[PDB]
Ligand binder design. Structure first.
Ligand SMILES: [Cl-]
Ligand code: NA
Ligand code: NA
Lengths: 113, 113
């Protein structure tokens, strides 16, 4: 499929809990290729899953370091991690091997509740 | 622009989720490049509900509905029949300029994470 190559930037980030586990959530502002914009909320573990999937096929993405909850989550972590996730999005969106996979469209399009 | 999207409800089965549920595979394409999503009857109904609260005119569009005990199976006749109504529904909302700008519809028809 092809809906053009999108733009995506992580703006706001949050730390909170789910299932009594600290989780980091990121609001991604998405746009079509240059009311054609929307925002999705994605957990760090969802970014990690996407990176795992894409990296199996395209190991160059190994060089892209993602944040980990191996450390509690603090505001410094949220700032750094949101830059790391933006570098990851920038790498994927500019890579013609990946930037129009349905896995990326699934990740960046609005989700059903 | 979702106004150029086509969505065909292609097959239907009874599926098990924890309740016997009616489930559909929807073939989406750009009618001006294709993918398929899996959607439960209740998700079609939820979409209709969202769109109808916002646009009460839609309340005349009739969806299939069930009143049954959760364990009770769904007959194949209802499943086959119900596809047509769900197709008519998708075509009506996809042709309304206002509704096809709805994020609810985009979430419903885009690939799922
Ligand atoms: Cl950044
Ligand atoms: Na997380
Ligand atoms: Na259902």
């Amino acid at each position: 499929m092809n809906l053009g190559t999108w733009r995506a930037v992580v703006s706001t980030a949050e730390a909170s809990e789910e299932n009594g586990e600290q989780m980091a959530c990121y609001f991604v502002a998405v746009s079509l290729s240059e009311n054609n914009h929307w925002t999705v909320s994605r957990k760090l573990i969802e970014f990690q899953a996407l990176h795992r999937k894409l990296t199996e096929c395209f190991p160059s993405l190994k060089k892209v370091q993602l944040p980990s909850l191996s450390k509690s989550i603090d505001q410094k972590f949220l700032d750094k991690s949101k830059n790391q996730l933006n570098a990851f999005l920038q790498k994927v969106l500019t890579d013609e091997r990946m930037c129009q996979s349905e896995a990326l469209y699934a990740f960046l399009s609005p989700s059903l509740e």
